Design a protein around this ligand. Structure first.
Ligand SMILES: *[C@@H]1O[C@H](CO)[C@@H](O[C@@H]2O[C@H](CO)[C@@H](O[C@@H]3O[C@H](CO)[C@@H](O)[C@H](O[C@H]4O[C@H](CO)[C@@H](O)[C@H](O)[C@@H]4O)[C@@H]3O)[C@H](O)[C@H]2NC(C)=O)[C@H](O)[C@H]1NC(C)=O
Ligand SMILES: *[C@@H]1O[C@H](CO)[C@@H](O[C@@H]2O[C@H](CO)[C@@H](O[C@@H]3O[C@H](CO[C@H]4O[C@H](CO)[C@@H](O)[C@H](O)[C@@H]4O)[C@@H](O)[C@H](O)[C@@H]3O)[C@H](O)[C@H]2NC(C)=O)[C@H](O)[C@H]1NC(C)=O
Ligand SMILES: *[C@@H]1O[C@H](CO)[C@@H](O[C@@H]2O[C@H](CO)[C@@H](O[C@@H]3O[C@H](CO)[C@@H](O)[C@H](O)[C@@H]3O)[C@H](O)[C@H]2NC(C)=O)[C@H](O)[C@H]1NC(C)=O
Ligand SMILES: *[C@@H]1O[C@H](CO)[C@@H](O[C@@H]2O[C@H](CO)[C@@H](O[C@@H]3O[C@H](CO)[C@@H](O)[C@H](O)[C@@H]3O)[C@H](O)[C@H]2NC(C)=O)[C@H](O)[C@H]1NC(C)=O
Ligand SMILES: *[C@@H]1O[C@H](CO)[C@@H](O[C@@H]2O[C@H](CO)[C@@H](O)[C@H](O)[C@H]2NC(C)=O)[C@H](O)[C@H]1NC(C)=O
Ligand SMILES: *[C@@H]1O[C@H](CO)[C@@H](O[C@@H]2O[C@H](CO)[C@@H](O)[C@H](O)[C@H]2NC(C)=O)[C@H](O)[C@H]1NC(C)=O
Ligand SMILES: *[C@@H]1O[C@H](CO)[C@@H](O)[C@H](O)[C@H]1NC(C)=O
Ligand SMILES: *[C@@H]1O[C@H](CO)[C@@H](O)[C@H](O)[C@H]1NC(C)=O
Ligand SMILES: *[C@@H]1O[C@H](CO)[C@@H](O)[C@H](O)[C@H]1NC(C)=O
Ligand SMILES: *[C@@H]1O[C@H](CO)[C@@H](O)[C@H](O)[C@H]1NC(C)=O
Ligand SMILES: *[C@@H]1O[C@H](CO)[C@@H](O)[C@H](O)[C@H]1NC(C)=O
Ligand SMILES: *[C@@H]1O[C@H](CO)[C@@H](O)[C@H](O)[C@H]1NC(C)=O
Ligand SMILES: *[C@@H]1O[C@H](CO)[C@@H](O)[C@H](O)[C@H]1NC(C)=O
Lengths: 317, 171, 317, 171, 321, 172
């Protein structure tokens, strides 16, 4: 009378389905999820510096819309723009809005350095009832609305060299009056012009007179432009009317800063990966939460689940 | 799997084996029992754990990128931005699908392989003192008390000791 | 007396060469082709709605070139533009032609809704012998060539609010005369201007007087522009000359529509995948017919053949 | 292949076997014959079919995209449009090349594996009543009529019945 | 007494670590490197035609800045722009500089064909002390600075049909004076205009009067524009002032030509693959030298090493040492 | 590896074997010796060489592309140019990482496989005249001079010749 010795392996009563080269579904004893498909719904305030825009877009904070004055000294790793943001100053547009927003977002600061531009023979500090400050009319904090002095608006011609070792961002504009009467009344000349240049490039803008839709009492507009001045280069501004002048420059940096559109609330917690839906854990290699991410994030994929087998084939009794 | 042990010549797994992935069941004069094999279990676990750690090696940190949602129709530049992103997502989705398929095929094959390795190791230990029944079981042709079974399981079974007894019972 | 029992496998006299990790050519019993490399040469008219442009580009059908009048209000899944297409109306250009074409193609409709614009103090419905409609002078069907009434061309200033729940596409233009004589004769003022705006954006165009090359009898030109007005926004058009006015708006949609350049004939058949070379079967995962595709298509690859082994290694007798 | 059966210890295939992928040829007192093994054939087919169906899983449907041919020189934007597309095509071409290479290596190995599985299954059935000649053939050491051969092929061969006869012929 | 027959495999004293699916480091008997991580630091002069820009950008060679005159009619497979390059002619800008540079780089030639434009009633061949050619004032060799003749600058209206079977590239400009005095002195009219058109396109540029930064004595500028004329089309140039006229056209081609920014010296050797760091061998499938490449190159990857196993698992005899 | 020979039932490799990758060591009446197996060695080499040549198949040649370094801040277009390139580089870097991992796993498994193939081939040659000790060695149950060993190594060993002698030594 001998003995029997049987070799075998484990099983569980209910395994997990995985995909292979040959099968779309095969049962194994265990698997682990490789796609992150859920969020807390909240943006964690660490370890990245989160700046909540609240009622302000980055561009309104840059220009210095009065309700955005609280952002003047601000820096961020991630600026969060909310769908409730609104503009409440002189009606404006930005040709290439998306680029200006991108480059400021990427710079990560609104650090503004005032420069002593000399505007000879014009009135400075124009304001509007579309952009109220205190009891009176006002304007964008970083822009200087120049108009005639006496009965003349001379050819303005100023220079500002960059002798620093960083890039300077200058924001300026052009005013588009709604009538010929307003044009000549503000700037004397029947047609204005703004030419802003550095050693190797230039932009010339001719204003356009006509009604746009009424916004905060006005059919006129400002168009916003920008110029980067590199170390060793020089800014020249030349205008015989309609110039919305810079007061200085924004000190540019490079680094890890960006901007995101989201309505998720900010919370006190730690998460490396941020999506517009909220922060997500980054222990998994893939995620299906949002193609928009910031930080150390799983890669976006279309699958909502992908199981990595962590055990053998399940062959129950 | 490629080796034909798991879901193969071994009919099914043991739900009762909760202390290991592979092991032994025996019947002798003293009754029946079960014991997990640690070495084979460990080899499977180490390989699966190794591949898990390779797959979750954190590799991706991105900051400022391109916009991916747009509130206005713009035409050419926006078409390109969307196409670039859609292209990227499809390629990574493909990579993810292929990765799991290849990993999973391989995990099934390596676990099947470890079953087979344990079976051939046991067979080699037993030399001429046992025969392969074909269902993952060895008919042992001699008296094999619980000490003798443990000797096989912990790798110290001396086949010479029982060879005459076993050879006689077989032939 | 014994027996011999031999285990074996099949072989075939004529195997197929395939590629593996270790061999660039090794023989297996059978294989299947994974790259679609041929087409019928015909575009199947199902299941996608194919609109054959014949003699017309999408833009000419949009503007309403008289020989394209048959396309009024048409819809498509795929608009097919032919190399034989020609323009036969007022000579024009579209700054950012490619974008206008793309956005209309993608919208999938030329559904046009006429609006009651009030053009006070000008002559409407100008026409040209370069753009005949029946025997007499004509113009683009969706545009309204405004010129002086009596001896005056006043400042036009009109509005159209969007109180619908869909986006409106407005197509308009600016006329560029070839001489000062033509300018003042048509528009009185020596220099015109067109300003078209919504609450948030604006375009102002100054016409340019001068000779271009003769096209269909004319050295003058029209430049075509577009403006999308969202629900709740408002269009304002302001001009003291050279305005080529909209008659209404195009209804915008989103969906699966596109455009393709092809000379392949349309046929009555069914195919999910369309290329400029014609429809292709989509049973294979890859194709080498054309990188330009529409529909449920195999992915474009550079290989003209890739064989997937569907049997074992062939070891013949 | 990895298992060393097909193009290995089995010298070549049988062109005459047209009703299956794997099978048996025998010589006994009653003459010679051939029979396909359905189970092994089916297992190979099911796996190859499974991978074929995964590969032709229709996965992309695209509508409006970017332009990919251009009738005018434009510079920067067009350079980028062309580069985006060329980048995409090279990546998908790579994916396609790798896919077929991996699939094909694996198909060759899984078919080799099934041959080997059938061979080991047969060997186990025969227990001590046969010896492996080393060329894919078993010398069976007893009288094995056509009933006996079919018993081996359809899995009902009882080795105990012939063991004494066979053990005597061997030793 | 019988015999023992043992089966085995080799081992080596010095194995190499590689990565697998299951192990980030495991030892095999040998491996080979798949990432090219070094360059000679030199650009090989063969088999591609390398044109060293030396002191000149492609655009300065195109316009015909006097110190770039040696590049007239040059051709290249790869134009190499050096960080020492400088401009030394009339100060200028190119709206869409990057596109003009790209399209010329890609065309691979500066072949220029002079055409007999008739500029009635103006002075031709204007020059500046900002753009010396020999001892005296000069200008871009491919551009013609037109100014008043006597006390008039008429409306210029000229044509050049393309009756060839190739595309013509025309480079032209608009002069932006720094004062009204300069404007009327050179062009009479208080405001100029340049309109350049073909059958299907047109560009009108109005000059702008005002100071830009002083460069080589001048606060005025030229802005550079371009127009391609296809076979069967016709160029028309219409201006009542401020036109910087073309003298002809550049022949456009298509092919394998490009441009690269690099300071690596050019040397006598053969290499299919060029990077800004120098040429690299292309025997390996990947490289980590530079994402900017030209020619038959390994693909750029972020890894600086990737080892492909070229032998079995290396299993030495364990020692009690 | 999958087959459990290399780093498996074979305890270790032989540093002394310098003329092949796989082979034989024997002990008989006449002493001890070592000989490389050419066939198995050649099969491993051919497969590894085959995969090497596939991997270094030169496939890409690019001329004018996009710019990848920028001396000015520009915004949207430059963001897209950089993103396109960064996307490309990450995907190719992934491809390279995966390629080597899969190739290397397979190289280890194919070499393990060839060891195993040689072992099973030898075992089959010996029929009933030897037993598998379990460490990669066969105990041969008969007198096997250097001629007899070479007969096994070059595939000409006739097992019938020694079967009676061997069967007797094995069973009592
Ligand atoms: C609009 O405003 C700008 C800024 O104020 C102004 O441009 C400036 O003009 C002066 C005079 O042309 C430039 O001064 C030159 O600078 C360089 C050094 O970089 C020197 O080489 C020059 O010196 C020589 O030449 C002088 C003769 O003019 C001699 O007096 C002297 O001894 C030297 O030989 C000269 O100083 C200055 O560089 C520019 N600055 C900029 C940033 O452009 C412009 O003139 C104003 N426009 C009008 C119409 O007023
Ligand atoms: C050129 O034509 C333009 C279009 O007609 C003219 O613009 C119009 O100008 C008038 C004032 O002159 C504006 O009227 C004011 O509108 C606001 C309210 O605006 C909207 O909001 C309320 C709800 O809050 C809504 O009920 C209204 O319908 C408006 O939609 C009132 O509060 C004021 O009291 C006053 O009525 C028009 O809004 C404005 N329309 C547009 C679309 O801009 C322009 O005046 C003309 N210019 C010239 C030089 O002739
Ligand atoms: C400025 O120069 C351009 C180019 O030379 C002039 O355009 C030309 O204008 C004439 C008529 O004034 C066109 O002639 C016409 O040709 C057709 C046949 O093609 C003929 O049937 C008509 O009877 C007529 O003669 C000519 O085609 C046109 N040339 C081009 C190339 O467009 C332009 O008129 C000049 N303007 C001034 C004010 O000098
Ligand atoms: C183990 O792998 C390494 C590669 O990682 C092999 O080294 C390579 O072997 C040969 C020398 O036999 C070298 O190639 C030759 O180079 C000379 C000039 O250098 C040339 O004239 C020949 O035509 C040939 O290309 C190669 O440089 C060398 N590479 C390195 C990095 O060492 C080694 O051969 C392998 N060892 C074994 C035992 O297989
Ligand atoms: C589909 O149409 C394309 C576009 O005409 C064809 O590609 C051309 O044909 C040959 C080789 O393919 C080349 O000389 C041309 O330069 C190609 N043009 C382009 C834009 O690639 C293609 O051959 C057609 N394919 C089939 C299967 O009909
Ligand atoms: C080739 O040149 C590139 C850049 O010209 C080198 O990349 C730099 O490497 C250092 C680290 O040594 C980094 O800090 C810089 O960020 C890199 N610069 C850029 C512009 O990418 C690269 O090292 C060179 N490679 C070789 C082999 O010489
Ligand atoms: C299943 O897999 C995960 C991932 O390795 C592991 O941590 C967990 O303990 C496993 N669960 C069981 C029941 O084995
Ligand atoms: C910014 O900083 C200055 C100087 O420290 C301070 O006086 C001012 O109030 C700050 N502005 C805001 C909006 O906090
Ligand atoms: C995240 O937000 C996106 C965009 O609004 C939405 O479509 C998606 O379903 C959300 N996903 C999760 C997991 O919340
Ligand atoms: C290959 O594929 C199918 C079977 O799936 C069959 O019609 C065809 O004849 C096969 N060819 C060979 C040579 O087996
Ligand atoms: C176009 O749109 C609608 C039809 O739904 C209608 O207002 C209009 O008359 C249509 N015109 C034509 C020509 O079909
Ligand atoms: C299997 O083979 C035998 C012998 O030919 C046959 O008679 C029998 O019907 C078959 N199987 C079963 C389960 O009866
Ligand atoms: C440039 O080439 C053209 C035509 O091929 C020729 O007429 C001209 O003289 C050449 N100029 C130089 C400087 O080589």
């Amino acid at each position: 009378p001998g003995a029997t010795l049987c070799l075998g392996h484990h099983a569980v009563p209910n395994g997990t389905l995985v995909k292979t080269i040959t099968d779309d579904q095969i049962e194994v004893t265990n698997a682990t999820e490789l796609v992150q498909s859920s969020s807390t719904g909240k943006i964690c305030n660490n370890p990245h510096r989160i700046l909540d825009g609240i009622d302000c877009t980055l561009i309104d904070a840059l220009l210095g819309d009065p309700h955005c004055d609280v952002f003047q000294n601000e820096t961020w790793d991630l600026f969060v723009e909310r769908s409730k943001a609104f503009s409440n100053c002189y009606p404006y547009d930005v040709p290439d809005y998306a680029s200006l927003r991108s480059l400021v977002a990427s710079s990560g600061t609104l650090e503004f350095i005032t420069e002593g531009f000399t505007w000879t023979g014009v009135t400075q500090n124009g304001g509007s009832n579309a952009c109220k400050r205190g009891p009176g009319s006002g304007f964008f904090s970083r822009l200087n609305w120049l108009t005639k002095s006496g009965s003349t608006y001379p050819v303005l011609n100023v220079t500002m060299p960059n002798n620093d070792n960083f890039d300077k961002l200058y924001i300026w504009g052009v005013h588009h009056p709604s009538t010929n009467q307003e044009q000549t009344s503000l700037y004397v000349q029947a047609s204005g012009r703004v030419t802003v240049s550095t050693r190797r490039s230039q932009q010339t803008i001719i204003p356009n007179i006509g009604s746009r839709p009424w916004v905060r009492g006005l059919s006129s507009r400002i168009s916003i432009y920008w110029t980067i001045v590199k170390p060793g280069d020089v800014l020249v501004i030349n205008s015989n009317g309609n110039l919305i002048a810079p007061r200085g420059y924004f000190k540019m940096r490079t680094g890890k800063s960006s901007i995101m559109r989201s309505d998720a609330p900010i919370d006190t917690c730690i998460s490396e990966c941020i999506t517009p839906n909220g922060s997500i854990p980054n222990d998994k290699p893939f995620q299906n939460v949002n193609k928009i991410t910031y930080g150390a994030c799983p890669k976006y994929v279309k699958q909502n689940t992908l199981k990595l087998a962590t055990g053998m084939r399940n062959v129950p009794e | 799997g490629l080796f034909g042990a798991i879901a193969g010549f071994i009919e099914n797994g043991w739900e009762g084996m909760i202390d290991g992935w592979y092991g032994f069941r025996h019947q002798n004069s003293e009754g029946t029992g079960q014991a997990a094999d640690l070495k084979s279990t460990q080899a499977a676990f180490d390989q699966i754990n190794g591949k898990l750690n390779r797959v979750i090696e954190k590799t991706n940190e991105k900051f400022h990128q391109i916009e991916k949602e747009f509130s206005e129709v713009e035409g050419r530049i926006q078409d390109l931005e969307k196409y670039v992103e859609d292209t990227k997502i499809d390629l990574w989705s493909y990579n993810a699908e292929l990765l799991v398929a290849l990993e999973n095929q391989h995990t099934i094959d390596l676990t099947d392989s470890e079953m087979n390795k344990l079976f051939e190791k046991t067979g080699r230990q037993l030399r001429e003192n046992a025969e392969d029944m074909g269902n993952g079981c060895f008919k042992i042709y001699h008296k094999c008390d619980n000490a003798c079974i443990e000797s096989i399981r912990n790798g110290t079974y001396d086949h010479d000791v029982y060879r005459d007894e076993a050879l006689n019972n077989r032939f």
